[PDB]
Structure 1
Amino acid sequence: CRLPPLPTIREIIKLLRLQAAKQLSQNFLLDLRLTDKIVRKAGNLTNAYVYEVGPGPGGITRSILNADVAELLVVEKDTRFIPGLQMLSDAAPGKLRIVHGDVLTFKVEKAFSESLKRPWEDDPPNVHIIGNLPFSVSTPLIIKWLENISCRDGPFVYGRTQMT
């Protein structure tokens, strides 16, 4: 797959219409080797439904796409990155579903098909979650998803979904 080039920091600064490098208020992992490492540690994703959060520039997104994922659902809150994610989607037809929304409220139990929903006592249900979010958002999210596991609802309606 011929994916478009990864944005540089100058291109990111222009994209946020910020015109400077000091007021980013955000840190980007623009090194594809570390993102490749992270996706490797996420497990074998060949033909796996991956729900990715906090894409931003899209290093994790490109790394996941390079793995033979079946469908990749992406949720982005900043609309300014949606153009880049859209070009990335055009590069990979039918393997990227972008959604503009907030991960603390987005409802994943309806995103993927119902044929995926495996029992709790069987193996994890081929659905993986990967995320590099702001640290101010990852802890409410993990608390919320722990509550979901305790209730066996939300992303864990499919079974014992693994998170990275």
Structure 2
Amino acid sequence: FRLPPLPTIREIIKLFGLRAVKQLSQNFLLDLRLTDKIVRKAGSLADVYVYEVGPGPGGITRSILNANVAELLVVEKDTRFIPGLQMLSDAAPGKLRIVHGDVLTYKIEKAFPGNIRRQWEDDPPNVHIIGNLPFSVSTPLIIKWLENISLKDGPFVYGRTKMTLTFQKEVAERLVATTGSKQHSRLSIMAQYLCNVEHLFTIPGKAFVPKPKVDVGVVHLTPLIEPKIKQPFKLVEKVVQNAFQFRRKYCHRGLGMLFPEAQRLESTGRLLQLADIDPTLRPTHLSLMHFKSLCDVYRKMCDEDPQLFTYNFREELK
């Protein structure tokens, strides 16, 4: 019988390679004109110490290196892109530093000279964070970094360092969404109460390899001199999370989950009364100032009742 020919090594390597690329679910930006645009929209990187997260092939890395950068540190998790990055460092004498690490855990507190550090109320320091990461990494990273801004530590020991990151279109939308909008949610409050957030532009998915199912939003973030809420991050996070869980219901329904059932009617009413908020407002209409009132009242309630802050309504429902 006539059987199909054997696959060559080229075909075997191709079959493994193409499937290895799809395996980590990423979107490479090979358009140097686009990576130039991201860098351009981020502002002037002249004499700025730049931290790039997940450089990969090095598209943005190249665009950063061509921008009068004082120094560029990159942290790369995949060791397969490390050789090419080293090659790129060779073309730029003393401009590139490479680390094989995880951005979710790597500390940059001392990666740059302490002299470039600035006061919080000062102008933003000569540190800038830029990166195009996979969607699974970018989302928890900003949430980690928002908490760092709250604590004024981590990347923000240098001061109010800027961020220019890519997010999936919908996430980028929520980050900048104003009150009343359908995309106004947790990320909206969590980012805006700590940062000035600007949606620079949106890159269509066609420009990425391989092609993602969605478009990619480019967002610029700058920490505020005075945060809109002055409570612990985890407290703000819990109130915001509970407020937005039932989107089609009165905010009273969601905020009520902060309190044990035996006190829920009275405490939820008291919370909204003291915070001076209409109990019938849908969560989408809750502004940063509404949450400041909710958080401040909830804080006083927690200080009065130490059982309150670690209450979880799911555990009670079981």
Distance 1:29 1:102 in 2: 20
2:30 aligned partner: 30
Deviation at 1:22, TM superposition (A): 8.0
Runs of 4+ in 1 over 6 A off after TM superposition: none
1:134 aligned partner: 134
2:16 aligned partner: 18
2:123 aligned partner: 123
Write the deviation string for residues 81-136 of structure 1: whole angstroms up to 9, x where unpaired.
00000000000011000000000000011111100111001100110000100010
With over 3 angstroms needed to count, the CA separation of the structure-2 counterparts of 1:58 and 1:23, relative to structure 1, is closer
Distance 1:83 1:71 in 2: 19
TM-score by length of 1: 0.87
Distance 1:66 1:91 in 2: 11
Distance 1:17 1:151 in 2: 47
2:42 aligned partner: 42
More deviation, 21-30/88-97? 21-30
The letter of the residue matching 1:129 is I
Instruction: List alignment gaps of at least 5 residues for structure 2.
Output: 1-12, 165-318
Distance 1:115 1:44 in 2: 20
Question: Is 1:58 paired with 2:55?
Answer: no
Distance 1:80 1:105 in 2: 20
Distance 1:31 1:71 in 2: 23
* Secondary structure in 2 matching 1:142: helix
Question: Is 1:152 paired with 2:174?
Answer: no
With over 3 angstroms needed to count, the CA separation of the structure-2 counterparts of 1:17 and 1:67, relative to structure 1, is farther
* Secondary structure in 1 matching 2:26: coil
The letter of the residue matching 2:55 is P
Structure holding more helix per residue: 2
Looking at CA atoms only, which structure, 1 or 2, has the larger radius of gyration? 2
Distance 2:66 2:35 in 1: 11
Instruction: List alignment gaps of at least 5 residues for structure 1.
Output: 1-13
Alignment of 1:100-111 (within 5 A): 100-111=100-111
Write the deviation string for residues 122-153 of structure 1: whole angstroms up to 9, x where unpaired.
10011000010001000110000000000000
With over 3 angstroms needed to count, the CA separation of the structure-2 counterparts of 1:23 and 1:112, relative to structure 1, is closer
CA RMSD of superposed structures (Å)? 1.7
Percent same amino acid at aligned positions?
Answer: 83
* Secondary structure in 1 matching 2:114: coil
Task: Determine which structure has greater relative contact order: mean sequence separation of CA pairs < 8 Å that are 6+ residues apart, divided by chain length.
Answer: 1
Distance 1:137 1:33 in 2: 24
1:10 aligned partner: none
More deviation, 115-124/24-33? 24-33
With over 3 angstroms needed to count, the CA separation of the structure-2 counterparts of 1:17 and 1:141, relative to structure 1, is farther
Aligned positions, number? 150
TM-score by length of 2: 0.46
Deviation at 1:23, TM superposition (A): 5.0
With over 3 angstroms needed to count, the CA separation of the structure-2 counterparts of 1:23 and 1:126, relative to structure 1, is closer
Deviation at 1:157, TM superposition (A): 0.2
Deviation at 1:155, TM superposition (A): 0.4
